[PDB]
Design a protein around this ligand. Structure first.
Ligand SMILES: Nc1ccn([C@@H]2O[C@H](COP(=O)(O)O)[C@@H](O)[C@H]2O)c(=O)n1
Ligand SMILES: Nc1ccn([C@@H]2O[C@H](COP(=O)(O)O)[C@@H](O)[C@H]2O)c(=O)n1
Ligand SMILES: [Ca+2]
Ligand SMILES: [Ca+2]
Ligand SMILES: [Cl-]
Ligand SMILES: [Cl-]
Ligand SMILES: [Zn+2]
Ligand SMILES: [Zn+2]
Ligand SMILES: [Zn+2]
Ligand SMILES: [Zn+2]
Lengths: 524, 524
């Protein structure tokens, strides 16, 4: 029997450096985790021990820290090349800087194939990008070959900036003929590597005949067999076994996010490429694994331009940016309004004739706003200043919420008003009026929302049965601050861009900002 | 006795081409007026007849049409050089593109001196600009010399973009020592040429000992002796005689604006440079004076780049820009909100620690909005599209209004609501609520205004006795649409930038716009 070790990462999201346990900035080095220097140590150790190894990435290296802001993908090509990845699938965030920001820094500099079978181009872009990503690659491993077939979320147009040339096809429709073709070319071991989320990964394992293994991403899914080694609660066993329509057992794997774990799956194949067995577990990249000294030194050299960038002027404010708790946990604050306006600007995507933009609404817990910014430094705003306001290493995510859920959220926002608690909501595209003289849970007396399915944006009353797209911090999407209704009732959740980066991009685009307190939130 | 003919223009404001009677676009060529080609004819005729002639400009050639937008002052240097101006004083609009946009296109290319005695520079700018404008110039005329001493509005920092290096000194304080100095250099004929307004011109004639004649601008003041030749109603005789503190009669002249008239003043001087007599009148540049064929052909050659520019994309909208009368004469319309937001953006000037910006408020009569802009042309917005929305050739001016005056304006806005009349006000920095069930003149039930003297902009109730800065169209500042209270009660009025240009600049800066209807105007 021929044994393959599949090492895999997904949704690394610009965590080039080691992180805290929660994937935010490393403070207590002795307890820090992940980073590419530590990954390198572990991959090197495994490749000493196991003859047949693939190292695969299921997409979403782009976006997440100042690394991406400054280096724009060059850091991904450089450090993935240093780790000698065998292949990567395109994720939705690989489109954050458009097609041009994928071609130049990554497709042209990666020393490994970059895969997606379900993305097609037309017009002059088709000629420009031909062969720079591939539907699949057949890779030699020892004396055998393994086909790797890529896929990318059909939803990428709503979750990134791919432009209007590229078409994202249904994954199973696109995959099946490519898998069928590899069979005709005497390739009998096939891995589907891609970036659509655990639920689509399970459908691909089930329905795409000839796929032996699915290595996925996007949903930051943590799978484990046994007692988990850290804070992450498993969503299922590792690997997750799907029974295919042809009756085979097909392992499905993912490895959380943020470079905290290395996926590790051992597959035994018979002579005909059938999976006889599969077992493994992600490996927690904790401090017991030393950071490779050479990779670490290279990371520290690359950090210099980040430190320099962090104190550069991004733009100016002519107003005090009031991110004080005494304001932002009690009433509409202009820093809240700025951040929500930035969130909506970041989520301007291509529109249909059916909507001016797919999303118009934002909520932000006031406890997430951690500093004001004084305007008396010649109006200057720096990344360092924004990192004081938004220090937690989060993202601004897209969710779908029924109006009833959102009304429950606004009641929760003021359920114990007056104690300077973090749940008070700052907003964009929402006008709320509270009456604090009413009972907790009946304090919202008006709630109007900005239309999307309209050519002229205007406010109308919230409808309890209607589903709304909302941009909000991942802290809230995950039920932080007692927003259990958001976690339990949401219909869709997709991780978005780094919180600091969303604000920095908006300030840079606006050049001079002057956010007002304008009556988004009133008390009667 | 030595006779001088002073020919003078002021506040030409980019009217390079002949205009309609109201200084807007020429439609019926047979009845059009002004323009540099016609000016050239008249100046040439006078210089054939009169031995001693000066041709002077009292500032504000910059700003007013697409000429300035595209050519940025190069057209001013080129066509003023072709007319062989003898001198120009700096106006406030010569600072609209900063110091850099004055130095490069105008100061470096003018073949005549550019004057201002009351503007001083510091730091490296002082070295950069030294001698490029002058306090005065002594000019030979026939066998004599005439000193010309310049001045510019002390208010220029609130009315343009001069930057924080330049200091605008009190005019009389700065002028007197320069006039005193010219006397010591055997210069006994002195003209004060400058750009502060008729009222300051009269104070300079009165108080600056040794000034023989004041040639002014800024206030678009029309002076005439006799029956006026066109629609403009004289503010006084031409010249306007001030009695100086030393007992001399000092003529004060101005010549309206927009190149419609050529000022023409004949001065008789005795051997000691005392004015014996002064008489004249502005000359209406109407169609009875032919356009010089050579200058006209040059103007038509320069027009090609304007025609090309007019159809270029300035930016994009992802929303329908609703400038329909059915919206903008009846309720808050998003085109109204866009234009007011552009007006406030244009009037961001240097701030004190005493205000975030000197002005926060905008009103715009809905009848001034003449077209929507459809977003389905790939979102494109062109100058041609904006010229359909704002076709009247106006400006967005700065006024000071008591709150009582503004409340009367908002009552007038809805006094006969429901007939699709033009007086209905679109707004920025103002939240109004009407109750149309009340009597005309008592329909405003809430009126809140955005603070200026605050570090965080917020809304507070309008105060009847407080004076507010407001940006509004010149149509309204002049009492159009029955807004007689604005004309009769305002405390200050200064002409601003071309209406189309204000919007085009804002769209270009924003790149992608999405103005909403947001509750600035409500009905109860
Ligand atoms: N990752 C996190 C952690 C806390 N927070 C906020 O910080 C608040 C707690 O801050 P204090 O300890 O300053 O009260 C929480 O109630 C929540 O609003 C957040 O927004 N994101
Ligand atoms: N120079 C002008 C002339 C008219 N107007 C507007 O045009 C309106 C008249 O338009 P109608 O004829 O379309 O009703 C006026 O009531 C006024 O609001 C303007 O804003 N500026
Ligand atoms: Ca197989
Ligand atoms: Ca004299
Ligand atoms: Cl999923
Ligand atoms: Cl005046
Ligand atoms: Zn991701
Ligand atoms: Zn993803
Ligand atoms: Zn002027
Ligand atoms: Zn002026």
């Amino acid at each position: 029997p021929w044994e393959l070790t599949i090492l895999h990462t997904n949704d690394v999201h610009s965590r080039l450096e080691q992180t805290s346990e929660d994937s935010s900035k490393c403070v207590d080095a002795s307890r820090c985790m992940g980073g590419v220097a530590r990954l390198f140590t572990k991959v090197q150790q495994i490749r000493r021990a196991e003859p047949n190894v693939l190292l695969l990435d299921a997409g979403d290296q782009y976006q997440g820290t100042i690394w991406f802001t400054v280096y724009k993908g060059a850091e991904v090509a450089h450090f993935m090349n240093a780790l000698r990845y065998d292949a990567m699938a395109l994720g939705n965030h690989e489109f954050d800087n458009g097609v041009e920001g994928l071609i130049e820094p990554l497709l042209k500099e990666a020393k490994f194939p970059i895969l997606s079978a379900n993305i097609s181009a037309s017009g002059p872009l088709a000629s420009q990008i031909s062969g720079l990503y591939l539907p699949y690659k057949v890779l030699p491993v020892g004396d055998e070959v393994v086909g790797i077939v890529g896929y990318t979320s059909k939803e990428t147009p709503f979750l990134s900036n791919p432009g209007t040339n590229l078409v994202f096809e249904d994954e199973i429709t696109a995959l099946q003929p490519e898998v069928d073709k590899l069979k005709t070319l005497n390739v009998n071991k096939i891995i589907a590597l891609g970036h659509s989320g655990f639920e689509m990964d399970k459908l691909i394992a089930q329905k795409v005949r000839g796929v032996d293994v699915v290595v996925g991403g996007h949903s930051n899914t943590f799978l484990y067999t046994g007692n988990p080694p850290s804070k992450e609660v498993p969503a299922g066993k590792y690997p997750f076994i799907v029974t295919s329509d042809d009756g085979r057992k097909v392992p499905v794997v993912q490895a959380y996010a943020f470079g905290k774990y290395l996926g590790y799956l051992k597959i035994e194949f018979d002579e005909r490429g059938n999976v006889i067995s599969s077992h493994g577990n992600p490996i927690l990249l904790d401090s017991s694994i030393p950071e490779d000294p050479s990779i670490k030194a290279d990371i520290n050299k690359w950090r210099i331009k980040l430190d320099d960038y962090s104190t550069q002027e991004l733009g100016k404010t002519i107003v005090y940016l009031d991110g004080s708790s005494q304001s932002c946990r009690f009433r509409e604050c202009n820093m809240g309004n700025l951040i929500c306006d930035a969130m909506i600007n970041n989520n301007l995507r291509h529109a249909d004739e059916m909507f001016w933009n797919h999303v118009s609404m934002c909520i932000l817990n006031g406890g997430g706003i951690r500093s004001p910014i004084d305007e008396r430094n010649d109006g200057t705003i720096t990344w360092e200043n924004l990192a004081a306001v938004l220090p937690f290493g989060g993202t601004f995510d897209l969710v779908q919420l029924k109006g009833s859920t959102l009304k429950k959220a606004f009641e929760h926002s003021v359920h114990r008003y007056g104690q300077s608690t973090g749940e008070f909501l700052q907003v964009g595209g929402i006008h709320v009026v509270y009456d604090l003289s009413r009972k907790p849970g009946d304090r919202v007396v008006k709630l109007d929302v900005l239309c999307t399915s309209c050519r002229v944006p205007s406010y109308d009353p919230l409808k309890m049965d209607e589903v709304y797209k909302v941009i909000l911090p991942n802290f809230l999407a995950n039920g932080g601050d007692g927003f259990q209704m958001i976690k339990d009732e949401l219909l869709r959740h997709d991780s978005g861009d780094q919180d600091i980066n969303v604000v920095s991009t908006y300030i840079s685009k606006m050049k001079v900002i002057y956010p007002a307190v304008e009556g988004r939130i009133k008390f009667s």
